[PDB]
Design a protein around this ligand. Sequence first.
Ligand SMILES: O=c1ccn([C@@H]2O[C@H](CO)[C@@H](O)[C@H]2O)c(=O)[nH]1
Ligand SMILES: O=c1ccn([C@@H]2O[C@H](CO)[C@@H](O)[C@H]2O)c(=O)[nH]1
Ligand SMILES: [Mg+2]
Ligand SMILES: [Mg+2]
Lengths: 217, 219
Amino acid sequence: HMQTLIFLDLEATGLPSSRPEVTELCLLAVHRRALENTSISQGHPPPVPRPPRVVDKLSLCIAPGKACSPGASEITGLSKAELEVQGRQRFDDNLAILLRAFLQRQPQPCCLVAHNGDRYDFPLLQTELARLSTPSPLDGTFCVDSIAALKALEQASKSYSLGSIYTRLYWQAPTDSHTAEGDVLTLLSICQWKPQALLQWVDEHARPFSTVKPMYG
Amino acid sequence: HMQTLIFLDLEATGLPSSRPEVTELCLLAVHRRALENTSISQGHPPPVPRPPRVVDKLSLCIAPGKACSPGASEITGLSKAELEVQGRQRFDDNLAILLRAFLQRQPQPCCLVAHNGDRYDFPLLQTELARLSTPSPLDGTFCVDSIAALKALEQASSPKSYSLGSIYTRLYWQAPTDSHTAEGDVLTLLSICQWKPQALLQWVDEHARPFSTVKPMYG
Ligand SMILES: O=c1ccn([C@@H]2O[C@H](CO)[C@@H](O)[C@H]2O)c(=O)[nH]1
Ligand SMILES: O=c1ccn([C@@H]2O[C@H](CO)[C@@H](O)[C@H]2O)c(=O)[nH]1
Ligand SMILES: [Mg+2]
Ligand SMILES: [Mg+2]
């Protein structure tokens, strides 16, 4: 039984072929009680659920070592030059120390939830952490891809991009697409669609983050 | 010249008389360039500005050592019982580590900005940090009270309540959202501080004082 779900989103300099680097990271830590007490979804469509009162949130912009592709910069609204002029620092040991302290405030066991995590966010995060001297702060942490989760939840009762799912469930467009915090809030909203069912799915398919292979070396 | 403004709000178990303890804390770190490149406020009323794209955010719920007053739990929507059952940790050394590493990512010098901060947020934070073995992570950090800031700005602008909501409604003709939540109040404060960013930064540089000179509320 996971006690904490940590909704995660990364934005980066480009697509996996590009050997991308992280430009923004958001973590939203929600205790399982706070999630499973999100009210049922009635109506077609139901209203967009309200986030739980009690949450822990960390959102950071990160200077990459290489430029964002024009396309990445258009959709994320971020660029290496603007990140550097505002003094953003690299993905370095102090950041790992920060994440470690943030994670240690969460009850265990703890599971990251990210949309397309299995093929982007998690392997990329593994790569950024591998470059550090610091031992990984995520080794004891679990992770799941919300795509597989929502596929299993919908067929228990067609695109699976974040926006497609949110639109299909609430008949509205998400807000603040491809911003780390905005995407995390959209994912939380989707996961509050059937919190108990999702939580049971997570408990069954969560896997240790230490088993995730890096995106590149 | 302050290079980073860190908008800060604390919620707690009650008023200073009751020797309160922190229950929620939000920091919103904004580089000075992101603030002064906010679109110039025009129109009457102007729209509530968008937050700058580039920000660092940290919001945390904290288990207090004492229960909240009836009123405090009502306005904040928090209670010691609910924070505990959701596993929230107390104001401890690990939190001080988190704060230290967060501040270290911001360009220096860095200034805290909190509404009524001189009479509540800053002295209470100093009291919480003083209970810890850890040397204060705020020793090299500055702080200002946005009440003084907004008063000074409106006195120069125009040769009356200064509560957060009264200012926000006067500037924008709408009520704030999510009052007495840590992140909600920080977002409200940022919006009123984006009213006149250049003049605000000028006032902050003139009046930023070391957090080390802040007297603890109690203890
Ligand atoms: O159409 C898209 C979607 C995503 N990405 C890259 O993938 C990252 C994660 O979504 C983005 O920040 C961006 O770098 C693109 O380049 N194009
Ligand atoms: O009417 C009020 C205003 C503030 N507070 C206390 O002051 C904190 C914010 O200043 C709140 O979280 C609460 O603890 C009250 O108890 N009552
Ligand atoms: Mg994503
Ligand atoms: Mg306040």
